[PDB]
Amino acid sequence: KDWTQYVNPLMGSQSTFELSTGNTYPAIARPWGMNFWTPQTGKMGDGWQYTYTANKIRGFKQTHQPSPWINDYGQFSIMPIVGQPVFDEEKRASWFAHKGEVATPYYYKVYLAEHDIVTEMTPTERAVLFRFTFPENDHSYVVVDAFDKGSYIKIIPEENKIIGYTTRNSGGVPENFKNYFIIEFDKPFTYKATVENGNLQENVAEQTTDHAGAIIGFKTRKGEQVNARIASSFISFEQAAANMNELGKDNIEQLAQKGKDAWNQVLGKIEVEGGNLDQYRTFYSCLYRSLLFPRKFYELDANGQPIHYSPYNGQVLPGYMFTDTGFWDTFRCLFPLLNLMYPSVNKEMQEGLINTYLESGFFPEWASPGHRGCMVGNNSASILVDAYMKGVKVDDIKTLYEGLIHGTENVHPEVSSTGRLGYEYYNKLGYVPYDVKINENAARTLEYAYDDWCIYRLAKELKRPKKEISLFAKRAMNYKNLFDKESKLMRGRNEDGTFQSPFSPLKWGDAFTEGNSWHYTWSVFHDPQGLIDLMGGKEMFVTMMDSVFAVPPIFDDSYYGQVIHEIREMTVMNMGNYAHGNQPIQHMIYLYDYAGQPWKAQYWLRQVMDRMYTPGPDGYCGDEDNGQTSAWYVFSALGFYPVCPGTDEYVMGTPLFKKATLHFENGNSLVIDAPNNSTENFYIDSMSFNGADHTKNYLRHEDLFKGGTIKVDMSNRPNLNRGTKEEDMPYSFSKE
Ligand SMILES: O[C@H]1[C@H]2[C@H](O)CCCN2C[C@H]1O
Numbered sequence: 067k068d069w070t071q072y073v074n075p076l077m078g079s080q081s082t083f084e085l086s087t088g089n090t091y092p093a094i095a096r097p098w099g100m101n102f103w104t105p106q107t108g109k110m111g112d113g114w115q116y117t118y119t120a121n122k123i124r125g126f127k128q129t130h131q132p133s134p135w136i137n138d139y140g141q142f143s144i145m146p147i148v149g150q151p152v153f154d155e156e157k158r159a160s161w162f163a164h165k166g167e168v169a170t171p172y173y174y175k176v177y178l179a180e181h182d183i184v185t186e187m188t189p190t191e192r193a194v195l196f197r198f199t200f201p202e203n204d205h206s207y208v209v210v211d212a213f214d215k216g217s218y219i220k221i222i223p224e225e226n227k228i229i230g231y232t233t234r235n236s237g238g239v240p241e242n243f244k245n246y247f248i249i250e251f252d253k254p255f256t257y258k259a260t261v262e263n264g265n266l267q268e269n270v271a272e273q274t275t276d277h278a279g280a281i282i283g284f285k286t287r288k289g290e291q292v293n294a295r296i297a298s299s300f301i302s303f304e305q306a307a308a309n310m311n312e313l314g315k316d317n318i319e320q321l322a323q324k325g326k327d328a329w330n331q332v333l334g335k336i337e338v339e340g341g342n343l344d345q346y347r348t349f350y351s352c353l354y355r356s357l358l359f360p361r362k363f364y365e366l367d368a369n370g371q372p373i374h375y376s377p378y379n380g381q382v383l384p385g386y387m388f389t390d391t392g393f394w395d396t397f398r399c400l401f402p403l404l405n406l407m408y409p410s411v412n413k414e415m416q417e418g419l420i421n422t423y424l425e426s427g428f429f430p431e432w433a434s435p436g437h438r439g440c441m442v443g444n445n446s447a448s449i450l451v452d453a454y455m456k457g458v459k460v461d462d463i464k465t466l467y468e469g470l471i472h473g474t475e476n477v478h479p480e481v482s483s484t485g486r487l488g489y490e491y492y493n494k495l496g497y498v499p500y501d502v503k504i505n506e507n508a509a510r511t512l513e514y515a516y517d518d519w520c521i522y523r524l525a526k527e528l529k530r531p532k533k534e535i536s537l538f539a540k541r542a543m544n545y546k547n548l549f550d551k552e553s554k555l556m557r558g559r560n561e562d563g564t565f566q567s568p569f570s571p572l573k574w575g576d577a578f579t580e581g582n583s584w585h586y587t588w589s590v591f592h593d594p595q596g597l598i599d600l601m602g603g604k605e606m607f608v609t610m611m612d613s614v615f616a617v618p619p620i621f622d623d624s625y626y627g628q629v630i631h632e633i634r635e636m637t638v639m640n641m642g643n644y645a646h647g648n649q650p651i652q653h654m655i656y657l658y659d660y661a662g663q664p665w666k667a668q669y670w671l672r673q674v675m676d677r678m679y680t681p682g683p684d685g686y687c688g689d690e691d692n693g694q695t696s697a698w699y700v701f702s703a704l705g706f707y708p709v710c711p712g713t714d715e716y717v718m719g720t721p722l723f724k725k726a727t728l729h730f731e732n733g734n735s736l737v738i739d740a741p742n743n744s745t746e747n748f749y750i751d752s753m754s755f756n757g758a759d760h761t762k763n764y765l766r767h768e769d770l771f772k773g774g775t776i777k778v779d780m781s782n783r784p785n786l787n788r789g790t791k792e793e794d795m796p797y798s799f800s801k802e
């Protein structure tokens with residue numbers, strides 16, 4: 067039963083700086099793999115390491131890059147060639163075409179047209195097997211590139227082996243950071259050379275220099291295959307060698323099979339039927355993208371116990387560690403998805419977070435590998451609390467709570483996105499002022515508020531002191547401090563307490579991050595009713611939502627000076643100011659449920675799923691962002707979305723398929739039957755849950771886990787009476 071056939075790793079690779087259609091590369095990897103491998107079309111150092119329209123491949127690279135914007139670390143490449151032994155990354159490059167390329171999560175193949183060589187790779191979590199099919203030539207070589215900024219290489223002929231380490235990175239690493247790699251060939255070298263800053267040196271065994279490389283070679287018969295076993299570690303050569311054992315004695319075929327099995331095992335936890343081939347492809351591609359980040363950053367020791375290099379303090383320590391995710395993106399639904407279908411995995415991740423705190427002093431917000439300065443918010447709180455509240459509990463709860471509290475009153479000395487920048491003002495005034503030299507104050511305030519709700523939630527659960535509990539309950543209401551009654555919008559506010567003037571609701575950035583007031587105003591995940599109230603009741607609230615879609619996509623970019631890609635992405639979709647291409651607004655359509663008009667959510671949700679996602683190389687409508695934008699589709703296609711992580715609630719949308727089945731780790735299954743689904747029939751007329759009638763606009767975690775059947779009768783006309791009753795509404799803090 068194979069779902070991998072639907073996965074297109076090229077989806078999102080046809081992106082450019084001006085317009086993102088995903089900004090992804092073909093991550094050939096195991097789920098959450100420590101090391102990813104990709105064909106490399108971009109020049110060394112370029113965030114866009116693989117682009118669909120590129121003509122040439124210049125290497126097969128080990129990568130850890132989460133985003134072109136964030137860039138890479140622990141990176142080196144290998145490239146087979148023929149003819150002259152050349153190290154230069156342009157001269158070694160080869161034309162190829164996509165019709166001569168086969169990309170799957172577990173297997174990658176391509177024909178290098180200028181060398182007449184076929185390259186195949188199959189990876190494990192930490193290692194990979196390459197098989198090079200050479201033409202007949204007296205001069206066949208393999209180039210190993212350690213990249214620049216200080217690297218090391220060494221050839222061991224008596225073991226047909228090349229070892230080295232690479233260090234080029236993009237920040238967020240300890241001074242001693244290194245990636246140690248080992249490469250074993252099954253064919254003896256007739257030619258060997260190391261490379262030292264572009265210089266080829268035959269028979270010099272070893273280089274320690276800015277940019278080390280190696281070239282080995284031999285005579286090849288037509289069709290002769292040479293295999294290279296490769297692995298790496300962030301710990302040591304000894305450890306890299308241990309990692310190499312993941313390959314066993316397997317060949318390309320056997321490893322591919324194991325990787326396929328591995329992926330089907332996770333993709334198969336969600337079976338969908340009764341859709342068209344585009345939908346299958348969009349859906350599983352998205353699911354695959356949701357099982358990559360954060361990556362494992364731990365390695366197995368002699369006793370099979372997890373240990374890790376600390377990207378926070380550079381020691382090697384026992385226990386789990388993961389990295390390469392930005393919580394500002396992924397708290398929204400990516401991690402919620404893990405808690406629903408892959409809690410065993412998130413348990414490891416959560417334990418990793420505890421270690422991050424122990425080793426770093428803070429919980430991370432953006433980590434690649436270590437703390438990096440990107441985005442805003444203290445959403446690690448949502449990640450941590452949502453997990454706990456959903457049954458994924460770390461062993462050290464004392465430490466968890468302390469960590470949470472620590473982050474409310476500290477900001478990292480060098481990485482301002484770690485901890486709460488502006489906490490002094492926030493704690494004192496109730497908001498982060500628009501005029502105190504802290505940017506994106508309004509976005510910070512709104513998210514901090516939701517964060518504090520999460521802390522309140524956990525604190526209550528821990529039966530902490532009333533004074534504590536009350537303090538966060540109070541701070542959860544801070545979003546009110548930025549609400550402008552006249553505009554009905556969230557708005558920047560001065561320290562002196564006056565709202566900021568001139569006010570441009572359509573201006574991006576400044577008070578907000580990559581969105582304007584019309585996008586950020588909806589960021590009250592824990593208290594939609596509270597928001598509804600400030601706007602003057604649900605009717606006015608719905609009017610307000612509706613105009614998001616109804617107005618042209620006009621904008622003010624003065625804060626950026628140029629039409630950044632996320633603005634352009636909005637303009638072209640012709641859906642008003644609904645910028646689905648970016649994270650802040652992604653939950654918004656579901657808010658219709660809270661105002662007693664679920665049918666409007668049903669209508670627009672189906673719009674988005676039909677129009678904003680296609681299965682091709684230009685498949686997404688904005689940055690994919692480490693699973694967030696993909697998992698949005700995954701949830702939404704199933705029919706529900708975790709608007710407010712930290713509750714046990716998935717707010718109801720509309721299911722895309724005629725049947726979906728979930729297999730939870732607990733052994734139960736849940737079937738969602740929508741036999742009458744169609745392109746036309748995207749309204750929910752009625753719903754029953756194991757035979758009971760279900761008029762609510764949400765489902766509960768514990769209920770889903772019990773399994774059974776949900777029936778959804780789809781219709782082509784909205785049902786104006788379902789889900790308008792007050793007990794149908796999802797959670798709002800104000801109602802508590
Ligand atoms: O997604 C936000 C953030 C990502 O978290 C990391 C890449 C750069 N940024 C783009 C923003 O939209």
Ligand SMILES: [Ca+2]
Nearest residue numbers: 648649689691
């Ligand atoms: Ca983004």
